[PDB]
Protein backbone atom coordinates (compact mmCIF):
# COMPACT_ATOMS: atom_id res chain seq x y z
CA UNK A 1 0.00 0.00 0.00
CA UNK A 2 0.94 3.62 -0.58
CA UNK A 3 -0.62 6.11 1.85
CA UNK A 4 -1.34 9.83 1.70
CA UNK A 5 -2.67 11.97 4.57
CA UNK A 6 -4.17 15.25 3.31
CA UNK A 7 -6.00 18.19 4.85
CA UNK A 8 -8.83 19.11 2.48
CA UNK A 9 -11.17 21.91 3.54
CA UNK A 10 -9.94 21.27 7.02
CA UNK A 11 -10.82 17.56 6.97
CA UNK A 12 -8.05 15.09 7.57
CA UNK A 13 -8.29 12.57 4.79
CA UNK A 14 -6.21 9.39 4.73
CA UNK A 15 -6.09 7.75 1.31
CA UNK A 16 -4.31 4.71 -0.10
CA UNK A 17 -3.41 3.05 -3.39
CA UNK A 18 -2.72 -0.66 -3.91
CA UNK A 19 0.00 -2.34 -6.00
CA UNK A 20 -2.45 -4.53 -7.95
CA UNK A 21 -6.08 -4.30 -9.06
CA UNK A 22 -9.00 -6.36 -7.80
CA UNK A 23 -11.65 -6.96 -10.50
CA UNK A 24 -14.40 -6.67 -7.88
CA UNK A 25 -13.90 -3.64 -5.59
CA UNK A 26 -11.69 -4.37 -2.59
CA UNK A 27 -13.25 -4.06 0.87
CA UNK A 28 -11.17 -2.20 3.49
CA UNK A 29 -11.08 -1.81 7.22
CA UNK A 30 -8.97 0.86 8.87
CA UNK A 31 -7.74 0.48 12.49
CA UNK A 32 -5.39 2.94 14.25
CA UNK A 33 -3.84 3.65 17.64
CA UNK A 34 -1.19 6.02 19.08
CA UNK A 35 2.21 5.41 20.64
CA UNK A 36 1.89 7.38 23.89
CA UNK A 37 -0.39 4.84 25.65
CA UNK A 38 -0.72 1.05 25.31
CA UNK A 39 -4.25 1.27 23.84
CA UNK A 40 -5.86 -1.35 21.58
CA UNK A 41 -6.07 -0.82 17.82
CA UNK A 42 -9.45 0.71 17.18
CA UNK A 43 -11.61 0.36 14.06
CA UNK A 44 -12.64 3.68 12.50
CA UNK A 45 -16.40 3.28 12.35
CA UNK A 46 -17.05 4.97 9.02
CA UNK A 47 -14.12 3.04 7.55
CA UNK A 48 -14.99 -0.57 8.46
CA UNK A 49 -15.45 -3.08 5.62
CA UNK A 50 -15.84 -0.18 3.07
CA UNK A 51 -15.16 -0.02 -0.69
CA UNK A 52 -13.87 3.56 -0.46
CA UNK A 53 -10.11 4.04 -0.73
CA UNK A 54 -9.97 6.89 1.78
CA UNK A 55 -11.12 7.68 5.30
CA UNK A 56 -12.17 10.96 6.93
CA UNK A 57 -10.18 11.00 10.21
CA UNK A 58 -11.27 14.49 11.30
CA UNK A 59 -13.15 13.29 14.39
CA UNK A 60 -10.55 10.70 15.26
CA UNK A 61 -7.24 12.42 14.88
CA UNK A 62 -7.71 15.31 17.20
CA UNK A 63 -4.17 16.04 18.12
CA UNK A 64 -1.08 17.07 16.34
CA UNK A 65 0.99 15.71 19.21
CA UNK A 66 0.67 11.95 18.73
CA UNK A 67 2.44 9.35 16.65
CA UNK A 68 -0.44 7.71 14.80
CA UNK A 69 -0.11 4.05 13.84
CA UNK A 70 -2.48 2.69 11.24
CA UNK A 71 -3.35 -0.75 10.01
CA UNK A 72 -5.32 -1.20 6.82
CA UNK A 73 -6.88 -4.58 6.17
CA UNK A 74 -8.06 -5.46 2.73
CA UNK A 75 -10.11 -8.16 1.15
CA UNK A 76 -9.29 -8.25 -2.59
CA UNK A 77 -10.02 -14.19 -1.96
CA UNK A 78 -6.75 -12.45 -1.01
CA UNK A 79 -6.33 -10.92 2.39
CA UNK A 80 -3.63 -8.33 2.76
CA UNK A 81 -2.76 -5.70 5.26
CA UNK A 82 -0.44 -2.70 5.35
CA UNK A 83 0.72 -0.58 8.27
CA UNK A 84 2.15 2.89 8.51
CA UNK A 85 2.79 5.69 10.98
CA UNK A 86 2.09 9.40 10.78
CA UNK A 87 3.14 12.58 12.49
CA UNK A 88 0.56 15.08 11.31
CA UNK A 89 2.62 18.28 11.61
CA UNK A 90 5.14 16.69 9.20
CA UNK A 91 3.30 14.24 6.92
CA UNK A 92 0.03 16.09 6.31
CA UNK A 93 -0.20 17.73 2.88
CA UNK A 94 -2.27 20.91 2.93
CA UNK A 95 -4.44 21.02 -0.18
CA UNK A 96 -5.37 24.46 -1.53
CA UNK A 97 -8.79 25.95 -0.82
CA UNK A 98 -11.29 26.56 -3.60
CA UNK A 99 -11.40 30.19 -4.71
CA UNK A 100 -12.98 32.61 -7.18
CA UNK A 101 -11.82 35.93 -8.59
CA UNK A 102 -13.60 38.93 -10.11
CA UNK A 103 -11.71 41.57 -12.07
CA UNK A 104 -12.81 45.17 -11.63
CA UNK A 105 -11.46 48.30 -13.32
CA UNK A 106 -8.45 48.72 -11.02
CA UNK A 107 -8.53 45.72 -8.70
CA UNK A 108 -9.38 42.04 -8.30
CA UNK A 109 -11.60 40.58 -5.57
CA UNK A 110 -10.23 37.22 -4.46
CA UNK A 111 -12.78 35.10 -2.59
CA UNK A 112 -11.39 32.04 -0.83
CA UNK A 113 -13.91 29.38 0.24
CA UNK A 114 -13.34 28.16 3.79
CA UNK A 115 -16.00 26.20 5.72
CA UNK A 116 -17.74 27.29 8.92
CA UNK A 117 -11.49 23.81 16.46
CA UNK A 118 -8.32 23.96 14.34
CA UNK A 119 -4.96 22.34 15.00
CA UNK A 120 -2.51 23.72 12.41
CA UNK A 121 -0.48 26.93 12.15
CA UNK A 122 -1.40 27.74 8.56
CA UNK A 123 -1.05 30.97 6.60
CA UNK A 124 -3.06 31.87 3.51
CA UNK A 125 -0.97 33.01 0.55
CA UNK A 126 -2.48 34.69 -2.48
CA UNK A 127 -0.20 34.84 -5.52
CA UNK A 128 -0.64 37.63 -8.05
CA UNK A 129 1.06 37.11 -11.39
CA UNK A 130 1.43 39.36 -14.45
CA UNK A 131 4.06 40.04 -17.12
CA UNK A 132 6.01 37.05 -15.84
CA UNK A 133 6.37 38.31 -12.22
CA UNK A 134 4.75 36.72 -9.15
CA UNK A 135 3.95 38.75 -6.04
CA UNK A 136 2.95 37.10 -2.76
CA UNK A 137 0.10 38.47 -0.66
CA UNK A 138 -0.30 37.17 2.91
CA UNK A 139 -3.57 38.49 4.41
CA UNK A 140 -3.79 38.57 8.20
CA UNK A 141 -10.04 30.60 8.89
CA UNK A 142 -13.80 30.17 8.61
CA UNK A 143 -16.30 30.98 5.89
CA UNK A 144 -15.67 32.96 2.71
CA UNK A 145 -12.56 35.14 3.03
CA UNK A 146 -12.20 38.11 0.69
CA UNK A 147 -8.92 39.70 -0.33
CA UNK A 148 -8.46 42.54 -2.79
CA UNK A 149 -5.46 42.86 -5.05
CA UNK A 150 -5.45 46.58 -5.75
CA UNK A 151 -3.67 49.21 -7.88
CA UNK A 152 -3.90 47.12 -11.04
CA UNK A 153 -4.08 48.22 -14.68
CA UNK A 154 -6.16 47.66 -17.86
CA UNK A 155 -5.03 45.48 -20.78
CA UNK A 156 -3.06 43.28 -18.43
CA UNK A 157 -3.67 39.62 -17.75
CA UNK A 158 -3.47 38.75 -14.05
CA UNK A 159 -3.23 35.16 -12.82
CA UNK A 160 -4.11 34.25 -9.26
CA UNK A 161 -3.15 31.12 -7.34
CA UNK A 162 -3.83 30.45 -3.67
CA UNK A 163 -2.32 28.09 -1.15
CA UNK A 164 -1.92 27.29 2.51
CA UNK A 165 1.57 27.56 3.97
CA UNK A 166 2.72 25.72 7.09
CA UNK A 167 8.06 22.83 3.67
CA UNK A 168 6.86 22.54 0.08
CA UNK A 169 3.43 23.96 -0.74
CA UNK A 170 0.62 22.78 -2.98
CA UNK A 171 -0.63 25.66 -5.11
CA UNK A 172 -4.09 25.92 -6.59
CA UNK A 173 -4.58 25.93 -10.37
CA UNK A 174 -4.48 29.44 -11.84
CA UNK A 175 -7.50 31.64 -12.37
CA UNK A 176 -6.74 34.55 -14.66
CA UNK A 177 -8.46 37.70 -15.89
CA UNK A 178 -8.01 40.98 -17.71
CA UNK A 179 -9.60 44.00 -16.07
CA UNK A 180 -12.82 45.37 -17.61
CA UNK B 1 11.07 28.06 15.79
CA UNK B 2 11.65 26.41 12.45
CA UNK B 3 14.15 24.92 14.91
CA UNK B 4 11.35 23.04 16.67
CA UNK B 5 10.06 21.79 13.33
CA UNK B 6 13.54 20.74 12.24
CA UNK B 7 13.98 18.87 15.53
CA UNK B 8 10.76 16.91 14.99
CA UNK B 9 11.61 16.17 11.37
CA UNK B 10 14.98 14.73 12.43
CA UNK B 11 13.34 12.54 15.06
CA UNK B 12 10.90 11.26 12.42
CA UNK B 13 13.77 10.44 10.07
CA UNK B 14 15.66 8.60 12.79
CA UNK B 15 12.97 5.86 12.89
CA UNK B 16 14.51 2.49 11.98
CA UNK B 17 11.59 0.05 12.18
CA UNK B 18 7.82 -0.29 11.81
CA UNK B 19 5.87 1.15 14.73
CA UNK B 20 3.21 -1.54 14.31
CA UNK B 21 5.85 -4.10 15.28
CA UNK B 22 6.55 -2.16 18.47
CA UNK B 23 3.09 -1.70 19.90
CA UNK B 24 3.66 -4.24 22.64
CA UNK B 25 6.39 -2.10 24.13
CA UNK B 26 4.34 1.08 24.46
CA UNK B 27 4.24 2.63 27.88
CA UNK B 28 2.59 5.67 29.43
CA UNK B 29 5.57 7.74 30.68
CA UNK B 30 3.20 10.31 32.14
CA UNK B 31 4.84 13.38 30.66
CA UNK B 32 3.84 16.24 33.02
CA UNK B 33 2.47 18.58 30.35
CA UNK B 34 0.79 20.84 32.92
CA UNK B 35 4.21 22.42 33.43
CA UNK B 36 3.61 23.95 29.99
CA UNK B 37 8.40 31.66 33.57
CA UNK B 38 8.37 28.30 31.74
CA UNK B 39 11.46 28.93 29.58
CA UNK B 40 13.71 27.42 32.29
CA UNK B 41 11.59 24.28 32.27
CA UNK B 42 11.84 24.12 28.49
CA UNK B 43 15.62 24.51 28.68
CA UNK B 44 15.84 21.72 31.25
CA UNK B 45 13.57 19.71 28.94
CA UNK B 46 15.82 20.20 25.92
CA UNK B 47 18.99 19.64 27.91
CA UNK B 48 17.66 16.33 29.20
CA UNK B 49 16.79 15.32 25.65
CA UNK B 50 20.28 16.26 24.56
CA UNK B 51 21.68 14.07 27.34
CA UNK B 52 19.32 11.14 26.67
CA UNK B 53 20.32 10.95 23.00
CA UNK B 54 24.04 11.39 23.84
CA UNK B 55 24.65 8.06 25.60
CA UNK B 56 26.71 5.25 24.13
CA UNK B 57 23.36 3.49 23.89
CA UNK B 58 21.77 6.24 21.81
CA UNK B 59 24.85 6.19 19.54
CA UNK B 60 24.29 2.48 18.89
CA UNK B 61 20.56 2.93 18.23
CA UNK B 62 20.52 5.86 15.78
CA UNK B 63 22.16 7.05 12.58
CA UNK B 64 25.23 9.16 13.36
CA UNK B 65 24.62 11.81 10.70
CA UNK B 66 21.06 12.41 11.89
CA UNK B 67 22.31 12.48 15.49
CA UNK B 68 24.75 15.30 14.63
CA UNK B 69 21.96 17.26 12.95
CA UNK B 70 19.68 16.64 15.91
CA UNK B 71 22.37 17.72 18.42
CA UNK B 72 22.95 20.85 16.35
CA UNK B 73 19.24 21.74 16.54
CA UNK B 74 19.01 21.19 20.34
CA UNK B 75 22.19 23.19 20.90
CA UNK B 76 20.90 26.10 18.83
CA UNK B 77 17.63 26.12 20.76
CA UNK B 78 19.39 26.12 24.11
CA UNK B 79 21.52 28.99 22.96
CA UNK B 80 18.40 30.94 22.06
CA UNK B 81 16.83 30.30 25.47
CA UNK B 82 19.97 30.83 27.55
CA UNK B 83 20.09 34.17 26.12
CA UNK B 84 16.66 34.93 27.46
CA UNK B 85 9.27 21.92 41.35
CA UNK B 86 8.62 21.92 37.66
CA UNK B 87 12.19 21.03 36.73
CA UNK B 88 12.01 18.27 39.33
CA UNK B 89 8.93 16.91 37.54
CA UNK B 90 10.82 16.87 34.25
CA UNK B 91 13.73 15.12 35.87
CA UNK B 92 11.57 12.36 37.21
CA UNK B 93 10.01 11.98 33.78
CA UNK B 94 13.45 11.41 32.24
CA UNK B 95 14.28 9.00 35.04
CA UNK B 96 11.20 7.03 34.03
CA UNK B 97 12.44 6.99 30.41
CA UNK B 98 15.94 5.94 31.44
CA UNK B 99 14.66 3.10 33.63
CA UNK B 100 12.36 1.96 30.84
CA UNK B 101 15.28 1.63 28.44
CA UNK B 102 17.28 -0.30 31.04
CA UNK B 103 14.47 -2.77 31.78
CA UNK B 104 13.96 -3.23 28.06
CA UNK B 105 17.67 -3.82 27.48
CA UNK B 106 17.62 -0.94 24.96
CA UNK B 107 15.72 -3.06 22.43
CA UNK B 108 15.09 -1.65 18.94
CA UNK B 109 11.39 -1.33 19.82
CA UNK B 110 12.02 0.22 23.24
CA UNK B 111 14.07 2.82 21.40
CA UNK B 112 11.28 3.51 18.86
CA UNK B 113 8.93 3.88 21.82
CA UNK B 114 11.24 6.45 23.45
CA UNK B 115 11.89 8.28 20.16
CA UNK B 116 8.13 8.67 19.56
CA UNK B 117 7.60 9.72 23.20
CA UNK B 118 10.28 12.39 22.89
CA UNK B 119 8.58 13.74 19.72
CA UNK B 120 5.40 14.06 21.75
CA UNK B 121 6.89 15.77 24.80
CA UNK B 122 9.02 18.06 22.64
CA UNK B 123 6.04 19.18 20.52
CA UNK B 124 3.84 19.70 23.59
CA UNK B 125 6.48 21.69 25.47
CA UNK B 126 7.35 23.91 22.48
CA UNK B 127 3.75 24.64 21.46
Swiss-Prot record, chain A:
Record's comment on post-translational modification: Phosphorylated on tyrosine residues upon interferon binding. Glycosylated.
Phenotype when changing residue 98 to V: No effect on activation of STAT1 upon IFNA2 or IFNG binding
Tissues expressed in: Isoform 3 is detected in the urine (at protein level). Expressed in blood cells. Expressed in lymphoblastoid and fibrosarcoma cell lines.
Tagged with keyword Transmembrane helix: yes
Keyword terms of this UniProt record: Cell membrane, Disulfide bond, Glycoprotein, Membrane, Phosphoprotein, Receptor, Secreted, Signal, Transmembrane, Transmembrane helix
Domain of life: Eukaryota
Extracellular topological segments: 1-180
Disulphide-bridged cysteine pairs: 1-82, 47-55, 159-176
Keyword flag Secreted: yes
Gene Ontology CC annotations of this record: extracellular region; extracellular space; plasma membrane; receptor complex
Single GO molecular function: cytokine binding
Residue positions the entry lists as glycosylated: 20, 49, 144
GO BP, sorted A to Z: cell surface receptor signaling pathway; cell surface receptor signaling pathway via JAK-STAT; cellular response to interferon-beta; cellular response to virus; defense response to virus; response to interferon-alpha; response to interferon-beta; response to virus
Family: Belongs to the type II cytokine receptor family.
Disease the record associates with this protein: Immunodeficiency 45: An autosomal recessive disorder characterized by increased susceptibility to viral infection due to impaired antiviral immunity, resulting in infection-associated encephalopathy. Affected individuals are at risk for developing fatal encephalitis after routine measles/mumps/rubella (MMR) vaccination.
Complex formation: Heterodimer with IFNAR1; forming the receptor for type I interferon. Interacts with JAK1. Interacts with the transcriptional factors STAT1 and STAT2. Interacts with USP18; indirectly via STAT2, it negatively regulates the assembly of the ternary interferon-IFNAR1-IFNAR2 complex and therefore type I interferon signaling.
Task of the protein: Together with IFNAR1, forms the heterodimeric receptor for type I interferons (including interferons alpha, beta, epsilon, omega and kappa). Type I interferon binding activates the JAK-STAT signaling cascade, resulting in transcriptional activation or repression of interferon-regulated genes that encode the effectors of the interferon response. Mechanistically, type I interferon-binding brings the IFNAR1 and IFNAR2 subunits into close proximity with one another, driving their associated Janus kinases (JAKs) (TYK2 bound to IFNAR1 and JAK1 bound to IFNAR2) to cross-phosphorylate one another.
Name of the protein in its database record: Interferon alpha/beta receptor 2
Gene: IFNAR2
Residues of the full protein shown: 39 to 231 of 515
Swiss-Prot record, chain B:
Major place of residence: secreted
GO molecular function: cytokine activity; type I interferon receptor binding
Any one Gene Ontology cellular component term annotated for this protein: extracellular region
Swiss-Prot/TrEMBL keywords: Antiviral defense, Cytokine, Disulfide bond, Glycoprotein, Pharmaceutical, Secreted, Signal
Domain of life, per lineage: Eukaryota
Location of this chain's protein in the cell: Secreted
Function: Produced by macrophages, IFN-alpha have antiviral activities.
Assembly information from the UniProt record: Interacts with IFNAR2.
Protein name: Interferon alpha-2
Upper classification of the organism: Eukaryota, Metazoa, Chordata, Craniata, Vertebrata
Originating gene: IFNA2
Full-sequence range covered: 31 to 179 of 188
Amino acid sequence: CTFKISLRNFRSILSWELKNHSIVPTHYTLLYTIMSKPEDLKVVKNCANTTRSFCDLTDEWRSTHEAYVTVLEGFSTTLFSCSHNFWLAIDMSFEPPEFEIVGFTNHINVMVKFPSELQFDLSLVIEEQSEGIVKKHKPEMSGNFTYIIDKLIPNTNYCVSVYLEHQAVIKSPLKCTLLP
Amino acid sequence: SLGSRRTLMLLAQMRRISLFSCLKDRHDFGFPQEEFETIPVLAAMIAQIFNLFSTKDSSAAWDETLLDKFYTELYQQLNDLEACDSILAVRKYFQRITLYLKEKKYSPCAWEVVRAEIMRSFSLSTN
